[PDB]
Design a protein around this ligand. Sequence first.
Ligand SMILES: [Mg+2]
Ligand SMILES: [Mg+2]
Ligand SMILES: [Mg+2]
Ligand SMILES: [Mg+2]
Ligand SMILES: [Mg+2]
Ligand SMILES: [Mg+2]
Ligand SMILES: [Mg+2]
Lengths: 287, 293, 295, 294, 291, 290, 279
Amino acid sequence: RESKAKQSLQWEKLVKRSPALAEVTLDAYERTILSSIVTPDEINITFQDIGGLDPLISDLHESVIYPLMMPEVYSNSPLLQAPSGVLLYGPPGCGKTMLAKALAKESGANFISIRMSSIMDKWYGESNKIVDAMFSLANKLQPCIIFIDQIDSFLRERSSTDHEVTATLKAEFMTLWDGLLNNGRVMIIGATNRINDIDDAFLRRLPKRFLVSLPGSDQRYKILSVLLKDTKLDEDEFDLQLIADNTKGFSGSDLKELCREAALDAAKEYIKQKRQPLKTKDFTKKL
Amino acid sequence: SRESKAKQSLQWEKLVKRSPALAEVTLDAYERTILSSIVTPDEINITFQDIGGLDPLISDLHESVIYPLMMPEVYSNSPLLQAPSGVLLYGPPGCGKTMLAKALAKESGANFISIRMSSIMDKWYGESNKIVDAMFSLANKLQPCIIFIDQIDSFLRERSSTDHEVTATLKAEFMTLWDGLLNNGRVMIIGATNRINDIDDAFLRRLPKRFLVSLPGSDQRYKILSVLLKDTKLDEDEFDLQLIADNTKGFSGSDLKELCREAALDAAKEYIKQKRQLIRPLKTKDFTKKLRM
Amino acid sequence: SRESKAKQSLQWEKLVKRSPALAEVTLDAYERTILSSIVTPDEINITFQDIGGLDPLISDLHESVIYPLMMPEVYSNSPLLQAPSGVLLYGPPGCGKTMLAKALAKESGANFISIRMSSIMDKWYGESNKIVDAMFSLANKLQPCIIFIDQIDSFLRERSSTDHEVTATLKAEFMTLWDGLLNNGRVMIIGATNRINDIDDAFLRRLPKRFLVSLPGSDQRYKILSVLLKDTKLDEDEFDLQLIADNTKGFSGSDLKELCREAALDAAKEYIKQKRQLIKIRPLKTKDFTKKLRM
Amino acid sequence: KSRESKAKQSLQWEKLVKRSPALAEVTLDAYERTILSSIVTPDEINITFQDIGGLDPLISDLHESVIYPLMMPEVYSNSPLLQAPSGVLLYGPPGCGKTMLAKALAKESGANFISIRMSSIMDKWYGESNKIVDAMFSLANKLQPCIIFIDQIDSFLRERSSTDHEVTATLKAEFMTLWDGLLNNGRVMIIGATNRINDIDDAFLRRLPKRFLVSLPGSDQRYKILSVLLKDTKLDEDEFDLQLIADNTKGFSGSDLKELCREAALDAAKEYIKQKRQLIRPLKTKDFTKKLRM
Amino acid sequence: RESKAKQSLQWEKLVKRSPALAEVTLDAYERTILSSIVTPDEINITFQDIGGLDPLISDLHESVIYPLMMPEVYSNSPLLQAPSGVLLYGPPGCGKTMLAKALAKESGANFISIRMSSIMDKWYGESNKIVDAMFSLANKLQPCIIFIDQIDSFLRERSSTDHEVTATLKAEFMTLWDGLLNNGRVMIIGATNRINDIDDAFLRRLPKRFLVSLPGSDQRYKILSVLLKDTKLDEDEFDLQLIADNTKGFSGSDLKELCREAALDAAKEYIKQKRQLRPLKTKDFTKKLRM
Amino acid sequence: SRESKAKQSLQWEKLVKRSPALAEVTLDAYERTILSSIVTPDEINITFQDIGGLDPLISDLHESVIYPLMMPEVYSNSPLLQAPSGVLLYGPPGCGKTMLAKALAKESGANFISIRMSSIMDKWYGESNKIVDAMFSLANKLQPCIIFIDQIDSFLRERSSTDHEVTATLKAEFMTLWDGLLNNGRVMIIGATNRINDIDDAFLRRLPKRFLVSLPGSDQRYKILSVLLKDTKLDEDEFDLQLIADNTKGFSGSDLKELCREAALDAAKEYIKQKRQRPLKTKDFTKKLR
Amino acid sequence: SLQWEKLVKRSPALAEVTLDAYERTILSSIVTPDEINITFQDIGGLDPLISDLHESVIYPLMMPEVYSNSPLLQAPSGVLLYGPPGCGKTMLAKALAKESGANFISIRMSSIMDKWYGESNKIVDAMFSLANKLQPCIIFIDQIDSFLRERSSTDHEVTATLKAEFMTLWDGLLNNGRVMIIGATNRINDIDDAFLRRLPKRFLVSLPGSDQRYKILSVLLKDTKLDEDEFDLQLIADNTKGFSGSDLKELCREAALDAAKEYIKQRPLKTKDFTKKLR
Ligand SMILES: [Mg+2]
Ligand SMILES: [Mg+2]
Ligand SMILES: [Mg+2]
Ligand SMILES: [Mg+2]
Ligand SMILES: [Mg+2]
Ligand SMILES: [Mg+2]
Ligand SMILES: [Mg+2]
């Protein structure tokens, strides 16, 4: 019911986006899996809301963005195609999933960001049908990004102690990942917080690795700059550099709460007027 | 079962009565079974002023957590003033972390999902991930939703090689729905634990707001004993709450409740033996008799 | 299984026989599996009169555990006069913790779920958590209920990262259903253990009423010997229970029962020999008892 | 389970039904069926109570305190303290005859015998070993006069510790609960043999009240053991001096004398077997003495 | 794949050796035990390759091998049975595993040369099942010898500090070795240097014990003569008795390297020519000898 | 760790590159994790020509270790011409045992499994014994293999009743696979130690070929100083290496290496200071010599 | 996280290094210059020792471009700072950490020790691996006589195995590039001969001389309440014969405490204040 309504709405948006999908024909499993296709309308974060990752944004535009959306520009050599696998890994909360958000927002390709419940199925045999529907829809709807959120759980360190169904699913993912690279505008992307849990064969299956590490001092400065945008601050009583060097060892999400929570205290009296500027002291008193 | 589905229907009726805007919306089957974990304020008999010794923590849990989530109209002047994505009520066992959850469920006005690990785990293949997806989808549908997972350390434990495939899959699915693509609305994932160090680093990241509900001090023990001894016969002269609070060194709130229960039982055994064969002003001697100093 | 289903049906029939109000209440499958651990008073042959030495402990257990649980009308004048959320019977082995549990299952009118951990733990994923959830739900349905876990130190052991996923989530689910958001009405979890220090701190705080069933004293040993030697001829002038009471230093209650077992066996060494040749009990004197322990 | 295991279970159930006709209506679940492969029928054991020498006071005490109270409850049903013990521990130095007594108990006590081993109890699956122990106790209750035997019981019922595996600690607690908790077993006795009594946990030692110390043999006990081992053998009428060997084998266990008898008889048969290999004799004391150090 | 192939190959070899084994079936754990079966083809050492221990070889035949392998000859008297255990103890290098190789090859017994890696498993209760299947397979291959080299670590003295899996493993080994269920012609052979490290119950489970001690002068001469088989030696300069006398305290390993080091230089002028593209001597051997 | 698996993959690639016939051999998981400890050539920057003062020892090591193992076709004419089951390089520290091990790794051509103790160690029950078993099985598969144990006195320590259960089981498993029933191929276990007496007696007899890398003499110290001062511009007339060698009484090769490091530092200190703003002589060596 | 962030900040090339869990627990003990508040100028009376430590420790290690004329000019495998206790070894290590530019892993015996079997071996292996991944690294052991004790047959198997694998990784096959060991102890004879060989550069931080005591005092009470004319520091240094650096700190603290007695109640420091606190 609601899944069918979401599928129809997503298909209407894709028809409005890509005119080449008017003649595109779909079976039951593919129609089922467009509910995982996300569009840049619901995503509210573009590439400009990420701070401290500007060189990584530059390598992103060089590797994942431009070759996928401008293959004619990157066609001087046959090996200039977009990579089959991109791994946006790093310590948790450093902005990898926001990088995926910005990819969906800015890159013209679709973002088929499935969720593991959608692929996973209780009836034996049907789960492989969901995987091949994923790959076939990704090939047929040509400009797209297969985003596999949390690459660690699926394609984990394989062993005989795991389920037979999950081993067959991993084998099929490897199988259609082999044919994934020869297709032009198709691509699989994973983003995770730990790398040791990734399967070594599947690690080889992602021949492009990104380093979303903990922010540095300059990266902390940029993160605090873009996190406090479109908010009312103060000029002389407030400074960001001392704050950035004070919050050493903090991921951007830890600064997100630090930006958020400390801004309540400076606005508690401001809220108290409706409940019934940011000094440099409010963020620092939260440390 | 039939009784289960009756409980799901009754919870849906209470949710519709609470928010009339929740009508004319549909739920999946998995969302429907997830709805059986909804706890409504009539189920909880614990009030915020039934918690003693945590008044600064009660105030902080109001201003930094409940008010930004409940009324975004006044916090919409700055989009950075929103509610946290997660709240952790950690501390030693005995303090009022779960009672904080009880009062927060009763009188925040937010839809409360008291999920348990039994309702999340399913023996069948891939159902648990669909259950967690349904939980987050229902939290999105009931827009001011709070999802409480008591004893959060077991659910969001550190990922390891010994972890079951379904468990690691469940944890990754929880992370994916918790933050990132297809972001939730006014959805809060509140956890309580007595072992904070057992929580995974990514899951610890997803709980940025952390409330340390530590062991009570002497004044905190006095406040806890005062709120526990409410609605009982006190002594205007012989009772000395300050002496009991001083002598109850290293006593958690549950330890003081048992001391209050044991003292009041001995303070009424003259009455109880009289009624059973068919109260009394409580004293410091009754409390200190069961107290070992 | 057929035998398990028959046991569940018989136990449910006994429960509705004991409490006629539990007829409209229905149960799911997991609660039906939990029902096979219900202990009816007819399954227990041990009364509180069969426990000696622990008479102050028995009286304290009654007035602080059983009467608040079974008579809320008497104790409803104060909100503090309630049964404990948990009771722990800890002490050295053989002193009578399981004896107290049997007398509690027989004497007190509360329905007794003497759950064993084999029925709790399941090899399938998430079944054990559902089993514990059903255990607590059935204890809620049979409103005055006692959930008994003998040797509770293994179930409620100290949590660690070396714990299995199933047992960690099982312990957490037990904590949540014990003292979490929803409140159990008149459910009371009672544990008998020998290693109290093995129990987790949160599980220990969920067992606030702790009973130390320690090793018997000389007067306690005399009381236990008098209880054990009931329905026995004994003697009148030669026998001296007091002398055995002093000589049994460090003897637990089970040590005295075994001591009484072989003492009565040697008293019957002449009578059984006549009876075995076929296919009156000789009066028991403390010469038979003293010859057993080498003091 | 394995096909050979299922065949053994079916054969054991047929043997138990034939021995006790009242067990036909008794039904078992899967776990009790796996326990059924540990049943030791008297035909499996070829060792008699008269094949044990030097333990006649211990054998008599074992009979009148273990076997007759369990196997003859109508004789002892006159006093509540005349019952069989809930468990029996056969302890002592190795080789003195603990397993000999257990084999005699398996053959000619009359109780159904479950010589369970720890490999049949432990399972790599979660909650399976506890169900195995529960089924072991349930099956022992169904075969009402039953003896559950655990050889080398010190490893099974070891002293509990925080370093114990959760499966092992849970297993020990379940064994304790079924051994003596609520819903007491009718006529189930847990007989155990060990040579490390101090390794047994205090609660488990509590559940084994009838302890039999099968100690090292004395001179007369060594004489009796040597006479039993040298039975249906030629020996001698004038040369052999069994008392000299009994005195000279100071500190010898029953197993040490069996090997000494084995080595002495081999030397006595060295000439005869040499003839037989290509295609006995009266044993003398010099055959035992030449292998003996004094 | 390789492990299962080894199990299959050992099973075909055992069926070829004994045709009665074709109709029997094995559990999965017994099949895992099958990979440790040692056939006489693998062993390249016989009883004639061991010198100095001719009385020990004769005793190991008469009291151990023949009662196990010829029960018809020994069945008239019930005391003439094979030992439940055999311990080959002594200082290292004297020929314990030499005798074990000769037992694996010359004696007609199936040989389970089990090691510790194939017994201990990390999963709960597998190791006990591995031991149970080892004894079950030894019973199915009825005249079996289970050889545990360096048995002092396996059957170590039990302590309260022992691991729970290790303690239950040792108890299961004791039960299947000498418990209620008698083992039919199953024999446990252990070689060790530290006999006192073995538990007393395990030591009593090994009744027949052979002390493979340091060689005497005559024993050293015999070992040197066996080691120098298929070697030119000499005719006039060679004096084996002087070498045997001057190798005081030398074990069989110490002579084997002495024979090796004396042969390296003896053929060295032949090797030096061969690398680009002789009879031995007493002085040659005396060069490495320290009198 | 992904780096560890990549290191095993690189070691395997270099192994099949060195030996083309090493292609159809399949490895278990434990053999694959032992494969990370392979020390291929050109991972070692030290040859036999870089070791001074050990020419008789190097020649004896060659003729008794390398050629009987690497070239069995020459030695097949006599059964006593086999390689030793083990080799022990013992002596006081700093005399060049690990130098000889590095030269064995680089120059012999044998596959070199220089396992450390942490590779063998495992917290899980039974895995360490499986690690040793797979190490020996892999050395059998890489048929002319040399397993090197640096600081062998701790791995093969004297067995005792106070030894840990896992370590005692490990040492017994190592002893069984070293010399028990199933004979190894062209597998040699070379070990270096400072305390030979700390090695167990059976582990010592499993190392029959013992090489004593003792403290250098006068001529040995002269050769060590000459090979240490190679590609270094010494003084043409003021230098006297024999005087330095005689003055370095009781000096190991590492002790001479530090003295050479000390003497070359303050010699070029003027050059280095001028760099940030040399004819090395005997007086610089005797400045740090007493 | 803090230490890894500082190591990334000091050199961006360290971000590309992939690490393991044991390497992360080693990263739990890498000491960064922000925690150190004491410089090389704080050490007095050891100017030739400081210059020798510079020219033979830090310049050969941190700037091998100007030390690449010969391979003989490389940094030593280890340095042992040994002498009378309380003489300046700890500040020598701390100032080397501050003014070296090298990552100063200061790890103790307690942090190496692990509960499970063989995990300490992997801790030591990942310590040396982490020092190898970030090449200009210094591993600091404090009181190395406790850790690198002389090997004995009575040693526990865990600690003997740890010491032997430390010797293997320190100077063994696959030699460590740019990995440096700083040793501080007061009992040089308690260290094993092989470990002592692994620290071939030795510094005698002995009891200060008269001029050394004068320099230590002059650095110690710099910018203090020192007298304009009535302070005979030479006489004080002569009186404190055979006084450790830690004794001079106690001497200066004791004299300043009595000199600030009027200030506590509310440049008066003189020779007699120092004289009354010495014999
Ligand atoms: Mg994410
Ligand atoms: Mg009990
Ligand atoms: Mg709680
Ligand atoms: Mg026995
Ligand atoms: Mg070395
Ligand atoms: Mg051997
Ligand atoms: Mg220091």
